């Protein structure tokens, strides 16, 4: 049973983890280093000497697709499709295995001794409001079901023992709190946050499994074995046994604070807004604890790399429903969800429009996708050279562009004319069939597969690079 | 194990079947009688004295929703939802049970003795080209899988032993033939047609189960027990053992004939077009055989009543995917598939547009739906009084109407500007939320549920009708 430390050791053995011994400030400096590293496809980073703290800081953990795959016990990135086929069936789901004691409760501090300032929480960007916890697995139960939800919600530092809990309103945690409030007026909402759990639990948390299902159960499937957990000290929630740090506490009903501004995955600052305050009553950690952090900003960043790997998970679920779809890609440059390229084997006139509507309606994660480009299967959706080629040789813009007004949009997307409402554009860049055009359509250049394969065979020997 | 005769007996016991002893021509007259009957919600009809023939003619079998439900061993129409929940799982599927001999092979004629003119095939409308077989279960195998498909394809009489097989190109039968042609050039394609099988097999044939699955397997689930079949005399296809008449034969490759014109379910004549010729080498029947027929025309007709009952089957499959959908209805007046009314519990601004796109993309049977009206849950989708009310009080036409051009359309729909391509219109007739309007939206009149229930209780006693 591999905890996070075992994963770091595996990475180090493979030249995928660098230990930095120079002094580096968690205030801005770590982010700059991680950003350059991620942008060059470099390793994960363990800062052994954060200025002013004793606890090392781990970041860029999932900065490459490879390391995301490795984190689910797979060799490489195309095994994620198989995990998609699995995620299909969940639309006896294995419980947690509760241990009696756990490394994450080796050192405990509570009440007045709680001081989040001892932790090397990072400040990512110059106009961010305060240090920000970015890799916390927040654990919650609602009043109506037993399911334990895990989500990653950014958490601003506002005191020795107070964090702001920034869950957006459709999240498991947020819905649990909302229901708790209705069902138990004025009663404190217990919550716990785990930092540095095992990679399967972390990845399970971020995968959009249905609200009905504990993210712990999914992590179990990725791992091959039940998720090892421990009961929290001050509530009935369970956290991963191997976690490096655990924060336990509650939300006082009605207590809120102005959150931000903070730089986002879109590359802009979010403006101030109100979210609940999480009061921390306990902090439990391992001996020699490691603090796991990250940053979001202009893409690409670690979340976006995560999000490309998790798109591979969705391809099979889309293909079950639309078997005409050969590939489906959300470029990290499009802020991970705002633009999709879809390639199909077109079977009839107007086919592309059915596929656009399918992307905009079938799965909720794509409901806010503003641009959808549809192409034939002779295009590689992951290469702008092919996609722009297809756009500029197979479209008449007015004929082949679909615009739909007054559709749901992310309320933080400031480019829509009104908060929560905007338009969508689909580009039909498929070959046009009789009926769709009265011209003689061009015959595209296809490569000889025998020549392709032969050159694959001698590629390394040719040694051009 | 209930064959068709057992079903007719059940209907007769319940005042749901009328035997007509007067002489009635299968040329036009039966259709006129059945049409008036169906339009008044009357019984199924057994014409014991068809002018010029000895074999009784059964029609309007499924002319009411009740009789469709009865035909699946259920009390009434809301049990069809449960069959939808079942049809979901199919996206060990029980085989057929093959008997050694069967009532449908009591009387056999083959080769030169085959004479389809002895059968009281109906001519439905005055400008129809020739008598037309309308309730044949066509049975086919393809070369690549073992699955036996069942479909209802209209069949024009063109000789003592020749019928035209009018399968449209996306049908199981048509795809099987097409593949047979590629895989075995010039070899005859064996085919068999069963008339008057048991209701579960008939309904199973018409239900859109995936191409991968034999319609026999589905009939088995509806029935509770494996479908009883018999091997055909001149091929390896199996037909239902209780069938009244079976036609066996083949399609000669390249043999085609001009089909039609024939009146359609749209209320217009289809123009002439070419389809394959089915050469009949055998006709097998029961002693005292009954000929099962129907007609299509301006709706409503029997197919359309079938199609409303089978929509109840889809509601659950839509609700699995879009749990916001409260009801989903395709009016028979809209030619059964061209217009949908959908009611939702709206949860955010722009929600209606996601639902429209879902109807146009999720299931293939709704891919050609040209109009989609979306409303809130205080509307009964089945009552034009509520739907028009919603349209005229909750829409600004230019703001709330979505038009999409160049989408797939039925090639027989002559109203689209080009064959196979046309536009779609969605009407967002939901209550508009802040963001979608800056006005003060009206507060609708809701009834008191206690008053409703009280009046339900005394309704019969009040005796107004
Ligand atoms: C991996 C990750 C994810 C997330 C986030 C972050 C990371 C690293 C951080 C904290 C760095 C950045 C923000 S941000 O991308 O919104 O700017 N963050 C985040 C947020 N979801 C959310 O509601 N608030 C958040 O604050 N998301 C997404 C969220 O955690 C994810 O959608 C979960 O699957 C939601 O789980 P459920 O609530 O559906 O169970
Ligand atoms: C119940 C019924 C159905 C059908 C039909 C008829 C009836 C009575 C008749 C013969 C009266 C009328 C025509 S019509 O509605 O197209 O005008 N008919 C029919 C036709 N499907 C088809 O390809 N050709 C047809 O000729 N359909 C629909 C088809 O049989 C149905 O879609 C099956 O589910 C197709 O099965 P698969 O090929 O998908 O396995
Ligand atoms: Mn969840
Ligand atoms: Mn079929
Ligand atoms: Na989650
Ligand atoms: Na069928």
The pair of structure tokens assigned to A122 is 């990072």
* Pair of tokens at residue B403: 């038009």
**Who's near A445: CB < 8 A, 6+ residues apart?**
none
Q: Which of A38, A90, A130, A154 to mutate to test the pocket of ligand 1 (most atoms within 8 A of CB)?
A: A154
Q: Which residues pair with B12 in a beta bridge?
A: none
Tell me how far apart the alpha carbons of residues A313 and A241 are, in angstroms, rounded to a whole number.
Answer: 27
Alpha-carbon distance B173 to B180, whole Å? Answer: 10
| A175 Cα nearest atom in ligand 1 | 38
Query: Which ligand 2 atom is nearest residue B149's CA?
Result: 40
Tokens linked to B297: 């025309």
Cis bond before residue B300 (omega within 30° of 0):
yes
Rounded to whole angstroms, the Cα distance separating A359 from A319 reads 11
Which helix H or strand E contains B452, and what residues bound it? helix B449-462
**A400 interaction partners in chain B (CB closer than 8 Å):** 406
Ligand number with the minimum distance to the CA of B211: 4
Q: How many CA atoms lie within 13 A of A39 on its CB side?
A: 11
Resolution (A): 2.6
CA torsion A452-A453-A459-A460 (nearest 10°) is 160
Those residues whose C-beta lies under 8 Å from the C-beta of residue B238, and which sit 6 or more positions away, are B96, B98, B139, B148, B216, B229, B230, B231, B232
Spatial CB neighbours of A69, under 8 Å, sequence gap ≥ 6: A75, A76, A77, A79, A80, A309
- Taking a C-beta distance cutoff of 8 angstroms, is the pair A303, A154 a contact? no
**Coil vs helix vs strand at B320:** helix
Residues of B in contact with A435 (CB under 8 A): 418-421
**A303 ligand 1 Cβ < 6 A:** yes
Dihedrals φ, ψ of A364, to 5°?
Answer: -60, -30
Decide whether any atom of ligand 1 lies within 6 Å of the A273 Cβ.
no
Kindly give the interhelix angle for B302-321 and B29-39, rounded to the nearest 10 degrees. Answer: 50
Q: Mark yes or no for CB contact A406/B358 under 8 Å.
A: no
Signed CA dihedral, A362, A365, A371, A377: sign only:
negative
Contacts made by residues B299-302, CB under 8 angstroms, sequence distance 24+: B299/B265, B299/B267, B299/B332, B299/B333, B299/B335, B299/B336, B300/B38, B300/B39, B300/B332, B300/B333, B301/B35, B301/B38, B301/B265, B302/B34, B302/B38, B302/B59, B302/B60, B302/B61, B302/B62, B302/B63
Resolved by: X-ray
Contact residues for A34 (Cβ-Cβ < 8 A; gap 6+): A45, A59, A60, A63, A294, A295, A302
Q: Structural domains in chain A? A: 1-313 (no CATH), 314-431 (3.40.1670.10), 432-465 (no CATH)
| Cα–Cα distance list, B88 to A96, B204, B210, B297, B363 (Å) | 30, 15, 11, 31, 12
Question: Are B244 and B291 a contacting pair, CB within 8 Å?
Answer: yes
Rounded to a whole number of angstroms, the distance from the CA of B349 to the nearest CA of chain A is 6
Question: B428–A418: do the CB atoms touch at under 8 Å?
Answer: no
How much of chain A is in helix, strand and coil states, percent to nearest 5? 30, 30, 40
Q: Is the CB of A297 under 6 A from ligand 1?
A: no
Q: Are A278 and A155 in contact (CB under 8 A)?
A: yes
Residue A418 carries which DSSP code?
A: B
Distance from CA of B219 to the nearest CA of A (A): 24
**C-alpha B37: how far from its chain's center?**
19
**Regarding beta strands B371-376 and B339-344, do their DSSP bridges make them parallel or antiparallel, or are they unpaired?**
parallel
**Phi-psi group of B196: left, alpha or beta (phi > 0 → left; psi -120 to 50 → alpha; rest → beta):** left
| Cα(A194)–Cα(A133) distance, integer angstroms | 11
- Cβ contacts of B99 within 8 Å, gap of 6 or more: B228, B229, B230, B241
Q: Is the dihedral of CA B15, B54, B228, B310 positive or negative?
A: negative
Which H or E run includes B310? helix B302-321
A143: contact with B, CB 8 A cutoff: no
Choose among B280, B273, B293, B248: nearest CA to B140.
Answer: B248
Q: How does B423-443 read in b/e, with b if 16+ C-beta sit within 10 Å? A: ebebbbbbbbbebbeeeeeee
Give the three-state DSSP class for A121.
coil
Cα A188 from Cα B232, distance rounded (Å): 73
Q: Is B426 on the interface with A (CB under 8 A)?
A: no
User: What crossing angle do the helices spanning A29-39 and A302-321 adopt, rounded to 10°?
Assistant: 50
Contact A247, A136 (CB under 8 A): yes
Tell whether A154 is in a known binding site: yes
């Amino acid at each position: 049973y591999n905890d996070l430390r075992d994963f770091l050791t595996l990475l180090e053995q493979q030249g995928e983890l660098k230990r930095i011994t120079l002094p580096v400030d968690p205030h801005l400096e770590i982010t700059e280093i991680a950003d350059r590293t991620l942008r060059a496809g470099g390793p994960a980073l363990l800062f052994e000497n954060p200025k002013g703290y004793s606890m090392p800081v781990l970041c860029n953990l999932f900065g490459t697709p490879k390391r995301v795959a490795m984190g689910m016990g797979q060799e490489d990135v195309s095994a994620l499709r198989e995990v998609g086929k699995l995620l299909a069936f969940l639309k006896l789901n294995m419980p947690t295995k509760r241990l009696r004691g756990a490394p994450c409760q080796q050192k405990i501090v509570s009440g007045d001794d709680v001081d989040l300032n001892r932790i090397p929480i990072m400040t990512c960007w110059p106009e961010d409001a305060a240090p920000l916890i970015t890799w916390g697995l927040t654990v919650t139960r609602g009043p109506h079901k037993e399911r334990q939800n895990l989500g990653i919600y950014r958490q601003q530092l506002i005191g020795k023992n107070k964090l702001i809990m920034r869950w957006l309103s459709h999240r498991g945690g947020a819905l649990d709190y909302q229901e708790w409030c209705a069902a138990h007026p004025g009663e404190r909402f217990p919550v716990s946050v785990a930092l540095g759990a095992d990679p399967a639990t972390i990845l399970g948390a971020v995968t959009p499994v249905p609200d009905t299902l504990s993210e712990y159960a999914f992590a179990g499937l990725l791992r091959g074995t039940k998720t090892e957990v421990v009961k929290c000290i001050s509530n009935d929630l369970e956290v991963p046994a191997s976690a490096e740090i655990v924060l336990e506490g509650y939300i006082e009903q009605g207590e809120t604070a102005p959150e931000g501004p903070y730089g986002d995955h879109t590359g802009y600052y979010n403006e101030v807004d109100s979210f609940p305050v999480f009061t921390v009553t306990h902090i439990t950690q391992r001996e020699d604890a490691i603090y796991h952090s990250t940053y979001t900003g202009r893409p690409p960043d670690e979340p976006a790399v995560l999000g490309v790997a998790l798109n591979e998970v969705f391809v099979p679920i889309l293909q079950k429903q639309f078997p005409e779809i050969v590939d489906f890609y959300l470029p990290p440059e499009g802020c991970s969800y705002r633009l999709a390229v879809v390639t199909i084997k077109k079977q009839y006139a107007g086919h592309a429009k059915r596929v656009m509507m399918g992307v905009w309606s079938f799965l909720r994660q794509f409901m806010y996708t503003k641009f959808v480009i549809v192409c034939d299967d002779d295009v590689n959706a992951r290469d702008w050279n092919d996609v722009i080629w297809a756009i500029t040789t197979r479209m008449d813009p007015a004929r082949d562009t679909v615009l739909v007004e007054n559709t749901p949009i992310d309320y933080l997307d400031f480019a829509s004319p009104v908060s929560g409402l905007g338009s969508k554009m689909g580009l039909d860049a498929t070959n046009k069939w009789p009926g769709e055009t009265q011209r003689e359509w061009g015959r595209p250049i296809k490569k000889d597969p025998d020549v392709v394969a032969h050159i694959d065979a001698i590629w390394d020997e040719l040694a051009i690079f």
